[PDB]
Amino acid sequence: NDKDEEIKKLRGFCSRYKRENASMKERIASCEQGEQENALVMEKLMEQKMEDRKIIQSQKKAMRNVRG
Amino acid sequence: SLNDKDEEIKKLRGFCSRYKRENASMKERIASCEQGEQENALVMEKLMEQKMEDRKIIQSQKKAMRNV
């Protein structure tokens, strides 16, 4: 009766923990997937920004060349 | 107070501490992922603002050259 209750209690924690852990792997996995998708967007936006700065520099030079 | 029960309890107690450690680490990892995702959103917002301002500068440069 004393050993039986402790066993019932511990089994309950184990089933609880096990359910919560399974749920978290699922959540962690979708998070990492979100982050992989974010990475592609960020990379594209960063390339475009640097490409814009390149154009700006090239145009700043062309005007410098015209003002001689 | 049956026969395999003291050991069964010892094993289950072990699983619980193990589950408890693994649970804590996952909570920590999910929070880091979510913080990463929040930061990413902010970076993209900054990058989008910068592209738009850069395009403004680029158009302003092409027109100033047109006007010479």
Q: How far is residue B58's CA from residue B66's CA, in Å, rounded to a whole number?
A: 12
Rg over CA atoms, chain B: 29
Query: Do the Cβ atoms of A58 and B59 come closer than 8 Å?
Result: no
Experimental resolution (Å): 2.1
Burial of B61 (0-12, 13-18, 19+ CB in 10 A): middle
The chain A residue lying nearest B27, using CA atoms, is A24
Pair of tokens at residue B55: 């395009």
**Contacts with B51 (C-beta within 8 Å, 6 or more apart), sequence order:** A45, A48, A49, A52
Burial of B16 (0-12, 13-18, 19+ CB in 10 A): middle
Q: How far is residue A38's CA from residue A44's CA, in Å, rounded to a whole number?
A: 10
Q: CB distance A49–B54 less than 8 Å? A: yes
Count of H-run helices and E-run strands, chain A: 1, 0
